[PDB]
């Protein structure tokens, strides 16, 4: 010859992928990587988050107290979990912003409950029920105190209670609404009158109304649940002439990262920083097709199921 | 490609190549072989695992939100939640759709760009001592011994050293 | 000499558009579309989405069962259009949260209603009303039945109503103000009472407010209006002293495509996609600038009235 | 333009072409000519049309949602649902002007590289018979009658039978 | 020797900066520009928007008329800005939409008063009270009327109140809660009063509770407030047999770019779009770092305190 | 970049040179020459300039809002009012970060670009005179004096005026 010939290329591959760009939408490279997680193993796991199995308990039936919700007591938690099985025994109650006290109790991550005594006269108080039993035994929620006639009277009560820590401090109380105008009357011999709770912030008036309600594990009445937070140099401040379900104390209200949701997925021994209802998912990519609803350093849901990402130049295969 | 080098004037790639992404072929009296160019399969990985960096990674952390699902009509209320939960998702899946699009394209076009810089940067080492036959493949017009055909890939051939030998067989 | 010339070029056109650019403002290609709809014909098309057209009638006059509204009983529609010169013509009324008893019948999407026999026992029925006029003669809300006095006794009505299908069940029920302390006591014999509807879930208390208003259309008085869903297994439980508007059925709660919107465009004979109070637009375009209330497959509304994507390369002519 | 072809090395375009997009114009013995050339046309025209075509594919159907319009002064609510509508209504306003600045910008650089691409095939075919004036055109130092032209416009030209003639009519 | 060489390049600096693109992280240009405005004086320019200082005025204290918040009397504003010092100084009150009463006062923009004479019939004026001091006089809040029994008597109120200009009113008033059935029956001889408001599309009716509240500057009562608007053609009307805090008039609503921030800057003379809790900063960069609380022709908020945009080419040493 | 000619095929920039973005360093029997060029130079300000005002183009002015700061805990509402503004700031802060890497990718590109078009610019006006040694730089093979050098960079250098001495020292 006394010539060479020398030829310039680049590599193929046999197997290849289909990627969108912004002219096709599908065209060939050599290697592409998955952008859209869509997968999960089905199971939350424990680490690195405090997750707290409620079980058959709602995050409302353990705050107040209910029997079968006693191992919650003082509990605290990055994620509570609520399960689709979760039931309520104990006394008939209906919270009216029950949507704003789950989230907002939620939010502060914790049931840890100080004790008050709150100076009661003239009344009975640990009033007990058919309907909530803590042993076939009559009993209450635990966070909660059933006022009622002390040798058939009933004195109107007037209570303060100063918040001279340096913290928010959140009540939990109720008013009891009879089923009938005799049991009105058994109970706090007055007819209906009013319960006033104050701050100098908040004000809150609730007028109980007798009226027979549905039937439910005995009795046909039914309990308003109301809450009340108390700024640090504030006061709460309870005035009423009857049908008080009274709080026995304050839960702490801090405020952080945790939260709550509502999944039956089990939980196993494992660790990841997403939380879907669905389970937990790597967070390796950006986005994920999982569920919308989150917890933790997550992707980014997305309604695509897929996004190729090229990693590599167009595969022209030979012929 | 907006370089016309790959599925350009290259009219295909080569399965048998393993050990890079760009390389060599060559024919002398002595045989042909094959040679990775590590330079340019370099430059090209490097690009794509840096914008592959910038998608992968944090931070997207959120910790307590609004409620997604209801097991209740509400009315007012829900139908904002429920309508600013459906905005975000929109413009995310957008985003998302967009950036795929617009970097897959890019990925493409720059992997076209270092073929074609290969090429050029061949060309400019061969002077007047070879000729672009438009396939890709450059023809020698000298005698090339396996020695030289690695100065050439290696950045080392003089081209002062072949030019009266070139220049004659290419002139008649 | 022996030459030849060989150019290489592109086409060019006298005529040109402008288009935006990351570099430049303005820049003139061969050719371009456009992005944005900004043109409407001012008509809303009667297909492919089932409007019904509201006329003198609002969503919740036609609910309740305004004699003027008779004709929409059991219509169903994919589009309810409400129009500003709708007026109410019966008793005297007000809905808190309107808005949303409005929105959630709007997306329901029909007014199909199922009679139901309530044993209501020493009570009179089918309480009329001029002001109400059902041609010439005194009638009341079609879908409602205002109780009073029988002989001048009214007993306190206590009466269930289960849900055995596999449906919601929407009740509308309302509650009467009278004026005068008189008006009270001629209507249901006792001084203010007390209206308790429950279910398993909810729990609803009104109680009666007797004190003068502006009085609308003749008459002293005013009904405030409520709703209660009943889920499958539920129960609605109504107990009243008086002041009841009670409900003769319940509507079907669906779930589906269903909305409302405010227009005084006028229907035409004419399909189009998507529809906006404006009338009407196409939906070929991805981006629209005609109203940001829309209804169906519709661009998504921007700011701008013009967005030009270039569709041919650079012109450049020939003087 | 990014390849400086279209109005860069190219002075103007033809507004007597009217059958293609890119195209030959030629002079020699038999005279004066010019013809649309297909696959550079049909390789811009594609591009465009499947670029325009994800711009509009246009998934967007929303049924019940929010109200917009308030007949009366009701305050928070209200205050959040309309800034819930703005910020969505700005978010996608900037998204359509962004994507029309970057559509066409990638629209003016991706046919000012297809006009490149067309000239460097026509280089490298034409090998040693041809001069590059710098202005589009080809200096093709031998006798090209109509067939042989029609023969560059078409992958087809055998310089080696043109290239005696050309070598000589260019060096002396 | 016939030689020549023409050598082309580009420039280059001994300095660059370091920006990012979409394949590395940071790579260095000749120069660049800073997109994030996160630096500002700490003061708000007085311009181009007209700035209200509140002292230690909250804007609701300035729209009731808190003793010392006299110099507020029929102001306008573009932004009113509320200070972490204010107090209340008059007789302790209550608003149960405090966030949507400040909201659309706050939008409204000026708190132009306009007298009305209702035409009270029997009963007392001008009530005062020690709790609301204007020197060692006793006096109350300047735009709302404290009407009281004269002679052992409250007759029912009945006022009518029609709007005939062309423009929007916004009425404020209150109900009186006090705190013991004793000061009920000086007050207002009627063991619990009421109060209706109603225009011909609203009805506010409110039954006081009487009860103890926090004890507030010798006071244990407190005062509900609302606030009614009537459009052109509507009407206002009250009746009340007690405890009605009545209005003086009414004030000129308005719609436009008035707002309200709280701050604790200082007011300087200069001149400046955009204003920030932290200061007015500069608008020329589209995106700052400062406050997502901003007012006026301002940069987009984003997380990154600095985006580095790229003016220059690569920037490329030698050694 | 793309075009392999800022950190490609030109080795490094110059510091020397701050009258001009792009420039000519020469050298002949009358050594010392340089002198940057204008129209490249003006071309890539010119678009930078253009993005740069197109980024800072100044629309958002807004009035009354939503409250974006609590004091008291509210629950549901308020949960809603911190999401909205949440999910606002995360999308404008993924848009502003998207907006730098694409500008500053294109500014690189084309920047990068306007070298190259220089460099090609420069070939052709030379034709057959001179070759490319590869980095940046023509050896040019007939005697031209400053007057010379100038016409090239004033786009005057007629190439058949010296195509004949230039052709001898090329191939002797
Ligand atoms: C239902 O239950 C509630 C509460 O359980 C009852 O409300 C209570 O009513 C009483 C009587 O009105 C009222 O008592 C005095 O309160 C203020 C408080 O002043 C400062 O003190 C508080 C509390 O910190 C104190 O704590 C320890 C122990 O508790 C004390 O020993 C300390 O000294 C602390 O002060 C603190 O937050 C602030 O620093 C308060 O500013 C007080 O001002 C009044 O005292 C007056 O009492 C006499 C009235 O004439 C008089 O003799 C006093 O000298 C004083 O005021 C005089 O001073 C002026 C000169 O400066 C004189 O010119 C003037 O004429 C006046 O005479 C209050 O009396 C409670 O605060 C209050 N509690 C609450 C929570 O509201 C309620 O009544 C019950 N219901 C019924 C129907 O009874
Ligand atoms: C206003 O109108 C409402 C609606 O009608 C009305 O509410 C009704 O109130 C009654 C009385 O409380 C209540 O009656 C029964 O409710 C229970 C329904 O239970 C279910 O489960 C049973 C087993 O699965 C099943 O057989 C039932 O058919 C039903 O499916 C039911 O448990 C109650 O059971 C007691 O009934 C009598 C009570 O004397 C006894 O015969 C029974 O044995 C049983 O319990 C007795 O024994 C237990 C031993 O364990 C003992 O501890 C206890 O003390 C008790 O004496 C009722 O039969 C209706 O359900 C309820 N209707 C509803 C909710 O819709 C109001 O009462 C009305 N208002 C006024 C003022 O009258
Ligand atoms: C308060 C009470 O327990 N009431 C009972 C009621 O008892 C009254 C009744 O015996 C009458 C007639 O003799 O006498 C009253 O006392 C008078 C006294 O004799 C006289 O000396 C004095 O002068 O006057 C007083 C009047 O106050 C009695 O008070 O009997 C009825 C019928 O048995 C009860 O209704 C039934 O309740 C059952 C269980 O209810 C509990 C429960 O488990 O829920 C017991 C709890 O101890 C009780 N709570 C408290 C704090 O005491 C609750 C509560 O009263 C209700 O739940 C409220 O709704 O009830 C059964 O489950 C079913 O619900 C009823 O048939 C009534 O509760
Ligand atoms: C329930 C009723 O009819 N109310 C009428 C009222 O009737 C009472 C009145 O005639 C007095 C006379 O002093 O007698 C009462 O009967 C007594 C009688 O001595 C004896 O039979 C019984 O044993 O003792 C009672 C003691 O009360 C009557 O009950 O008369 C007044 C004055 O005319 C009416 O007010 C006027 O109402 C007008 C509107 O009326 C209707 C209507 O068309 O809307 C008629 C309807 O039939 C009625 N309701 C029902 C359920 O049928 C409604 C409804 O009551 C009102 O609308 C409620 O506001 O009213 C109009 O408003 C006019 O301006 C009023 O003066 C009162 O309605
Ligand atoms: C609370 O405050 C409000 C303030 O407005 C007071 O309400 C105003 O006063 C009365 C209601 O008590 C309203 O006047 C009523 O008008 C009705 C309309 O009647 C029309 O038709 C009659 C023929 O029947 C025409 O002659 C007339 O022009 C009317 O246009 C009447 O139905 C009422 O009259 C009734 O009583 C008289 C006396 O028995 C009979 O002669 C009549 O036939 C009829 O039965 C009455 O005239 C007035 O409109 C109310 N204002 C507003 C704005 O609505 C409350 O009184 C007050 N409450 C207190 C202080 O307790
Ligand atoms: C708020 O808290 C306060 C503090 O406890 C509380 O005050 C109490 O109110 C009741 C009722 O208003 C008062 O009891 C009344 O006292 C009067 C004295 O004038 C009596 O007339 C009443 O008894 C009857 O007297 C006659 C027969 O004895 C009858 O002919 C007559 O008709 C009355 O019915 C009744 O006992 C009580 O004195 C105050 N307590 C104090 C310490 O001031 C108030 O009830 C609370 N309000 C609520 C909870 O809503
Ligand atoms: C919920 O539904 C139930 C079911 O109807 C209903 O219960 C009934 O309420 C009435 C009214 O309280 C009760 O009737 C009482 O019966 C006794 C017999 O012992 C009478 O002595 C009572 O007289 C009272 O009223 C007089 C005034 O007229 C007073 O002077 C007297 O002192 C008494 O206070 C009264 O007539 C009836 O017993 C119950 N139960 C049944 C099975 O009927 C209840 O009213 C509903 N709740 C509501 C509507 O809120
Ligand atoms: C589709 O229907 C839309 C709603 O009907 C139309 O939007 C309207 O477009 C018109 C254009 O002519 C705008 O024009 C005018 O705006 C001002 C209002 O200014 C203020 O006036 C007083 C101030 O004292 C006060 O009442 C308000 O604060 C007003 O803001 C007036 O000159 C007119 O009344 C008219 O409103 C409308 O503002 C605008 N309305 C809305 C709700 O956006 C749209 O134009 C229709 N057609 C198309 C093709 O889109
Ligand atoms: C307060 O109530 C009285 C009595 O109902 C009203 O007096 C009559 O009002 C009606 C309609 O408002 C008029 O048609 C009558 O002419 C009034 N009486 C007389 C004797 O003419 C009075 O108007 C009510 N208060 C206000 C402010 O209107
Ligand atoms: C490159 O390889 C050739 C032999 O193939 C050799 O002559 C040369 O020295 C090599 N380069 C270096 C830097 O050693
Ligand atoms: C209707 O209700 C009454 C109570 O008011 C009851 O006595 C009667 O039995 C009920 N009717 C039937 C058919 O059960
Ligand atoms: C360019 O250079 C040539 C020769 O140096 C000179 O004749 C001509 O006038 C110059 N033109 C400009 C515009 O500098």
Known sequence: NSMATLCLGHHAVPNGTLVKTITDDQIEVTNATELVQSSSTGRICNSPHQILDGKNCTLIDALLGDPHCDDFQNKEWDLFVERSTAYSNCYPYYVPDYATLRSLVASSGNLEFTQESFNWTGVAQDGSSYACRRGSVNSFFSRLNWLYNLNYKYPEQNVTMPNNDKFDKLYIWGVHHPGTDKDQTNLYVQASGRVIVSTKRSQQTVIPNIGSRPWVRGVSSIISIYWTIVKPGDILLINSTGNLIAPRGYFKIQSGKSSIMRSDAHIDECNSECITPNGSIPNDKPFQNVNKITYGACPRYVKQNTLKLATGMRNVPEK | ?172
């Open chain 2, 1 to 172: 490609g907006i370089f016309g080098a790959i599925a350009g004037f290259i009219e295909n790639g080569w399965e048998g190549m393993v050990d890079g992404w760009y390389g060599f072929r060559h024919q002398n009296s002595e045989g042909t072989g094959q040679a990775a160019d590590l330079k340019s399969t370099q430059a090209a990985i490097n690009q794509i695992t840096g914008k592959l960096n910038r998608v992968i990674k944090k931070t997207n952390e959120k910790f307590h939100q609004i409620e997604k699902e209801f097991s209740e009509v509400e009315g007012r209320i829900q139908d904002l939640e429920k309508y600013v939960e459906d905005t975000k998702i929109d413009l995310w899946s957008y985003n998302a759709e967009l950036l795929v699009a617009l970097e897959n394209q890019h990925t493409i076009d720059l992997t076209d760009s270092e073929m074609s810089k290969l090429f050029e940067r061949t060309r400019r080492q061969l002077r007047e001592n070879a000729e672009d036959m438009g396939n890709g493949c450059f023809k020698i017009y000298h005698k090339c011994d396996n020695a030289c055909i690695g100065s050439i890939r290696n950045g080392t051939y003089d081209h002062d050293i072949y030019r009266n030998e070139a220049l004659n067989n290419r002139f008649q």
